[PDB]
């Protein structure tokens, strides 16, 4: 049945986390479920409802924020912890029920000799309130002097690069991550599986 999970899970154009791609959707609904968890992934954790039974609650709408991160940094995708992605690149709210998926992507996203198509907002003035794409690549001022938007001693480009070689550790292969935020706004329900 007509649902869009393909172009976001088996996709080809996965963007950097600093500009993580929102995708609001309206799924496929029948008398049975909406997707399968996994046959070959790397990390998969769904809150509120156990990761084996996502279809247990119908949702009015969802946001499947897709991006790529390091291996171990999937750690700091989960709500409650405050890693480097959680504060500046991507926060999940401390009271959250949704899910996170992360599959290894060395075989696709790694260019021999060093891929650099993937960035992430390293510096940023303060923490993000949940889900605010800080797309602005404006120069960052860590001090008392604005720099007219030109890099200097304390004026730094805010995005930086992962740099995926193919020889990396198991915790450094780019895991393509897709995080499903299940919204709670009260309208007729769209996203779910069975009857």
């Amino acid at each position, epitope marked *: 049945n007509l649902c869009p999970f393909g172009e976001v899970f088996n996709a080809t154009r996965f963007a950097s986390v600093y500009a993580w791609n929102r995708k609001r959707i309206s799924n496929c609904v029948a008398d049975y479920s909406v997707l399968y968890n996994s046959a070959s992934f790397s990390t998969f954790k769904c809150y509120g409802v156990s990761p084996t039974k996502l279809n247990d609650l119908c949702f009015t709408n969802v946001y499947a924020d897709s991006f790529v991160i390091r291996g171990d940094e999937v750690r700091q995708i989960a709500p409650g912890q*405050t890693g480097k992605i959680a504060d500046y690149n991507y926060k999940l709210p401390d009271d959250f029920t949704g899910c996170v998926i992360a599959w290894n992507s060395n075989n696709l996203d790694s260019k021999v000799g060093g891929n650099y198509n993937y960035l992430y907002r390293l510096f940023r003035k303060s923490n993000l309130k949940p889900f605010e794409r800080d797309i602005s690549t404006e120069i960052y001022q860590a001090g008392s002097t604005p720099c007219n938007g030109v890099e200097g001693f304390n004026c730094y480009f805010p995005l*930086q690069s992962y740099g995926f070689q193919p020889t*990396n550790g198991v915790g450094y292969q780019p895991y393509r991550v897709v995080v499903l935020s299940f919204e709670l706004l009260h309208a007729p329900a769209t996203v779910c599986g069975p009857k």
Partner: antibody
Amino acid sequence: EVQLVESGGGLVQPGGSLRLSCAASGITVSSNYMSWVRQAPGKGLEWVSVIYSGGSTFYADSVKGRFTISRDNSKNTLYLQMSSLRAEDTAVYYCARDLVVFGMDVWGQGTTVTVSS
Amino acid sequence: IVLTQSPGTLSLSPGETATLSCRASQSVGSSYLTWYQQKPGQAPRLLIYGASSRATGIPDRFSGSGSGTDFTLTISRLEPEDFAVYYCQHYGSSPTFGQGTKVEIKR
């Protein structure tokens, strides 16, 4: 014309509490990854803790929970508040400006902490 | 993650070349790892950010190299101010310094 003042050495019994002071010149500590590291006496160089631009601390796994890293944005200060200390933590502690991809670039003078019964 | 730093120690003469081979437990990328210089007692300053990107004030005589299993800091023409102990740290979750490599004058 830029540096991190370090002050407040320490001479303490184990299990006590203590404090050390970092103070930025030019740097706005409310806009940086600040981080304390420690040299044990003549042994390695262990990273201790990090405070993010926003309030968020990450401590070394051997000093987890027992320390605290705190902020005074109003008067531009970084605080090491040490609790429930231990014998080996005798060290020299460094306040260090941090740019993870550019590496910790600005480092304080470092101040000595002695923990012993 | 563990960052061994081969070899144990390196002795050198003024004006001479140098290589120092930091070696990860795993094999890792090159962007994150950095190379610091510590004088004896003073506070550790920075030498190399990224794989080999020399930082501000860093003389052209320092060069990073390598990737994966090992990275190497190198010096073309020596100078006593370059005589210190170098720590390679790979800023993974949080820095994991190598045990250092005292650089001392061949005598």
